[PDB]
Amino acid sequence: MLKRMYARVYGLVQGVGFRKFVQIHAIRLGIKGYAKNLPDGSVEVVAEGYEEALSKLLERIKQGPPAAEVEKVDYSFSEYKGEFEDFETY
Numbered sequence: 001m002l003k004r005m006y007a008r009v010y011g012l013v014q015g016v017g018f019r020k021f022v023q024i025h026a027i028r029l030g031i032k033g034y035a036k037n038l039p040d041g042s043v044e045v046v047a048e049g050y051e052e053a054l055s056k057l058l059e060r061i062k063q064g065p066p067a068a069e070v071e072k073v074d075y076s077f078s079e080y081k082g083e084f085e086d087f088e089t090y
Contacts, residue, residue, distance in 0.1 A: 023089070031087060
């Protein structure tokens with residue numbers, strides 16, 4: 001039922017509202033975790049919730065808002081730990 005999803009996102013994905021787009025969708029889907037800006041310009045997303053919710057969020061992560069140029073997303077799944085209480089940015 002529940003999983004953790006990790007995604008790393010490459011392209012033009014900083015300074016373009018990419019994480020605001022991801023956050024709005026994560027909240028709608030009941031997902032907790034975070035989207036973190038890495039120094040190299042990539043974004044890490046850690047997301048926990050229902051597996052179907054994560055599948056839907058992954059679609060949005062790959063899509064991005066129009067200003068974002070999403071070129072590649074590497075992702076994987078692991079055990080839901082249930083420790084996140086909100087969806088944050090770092």
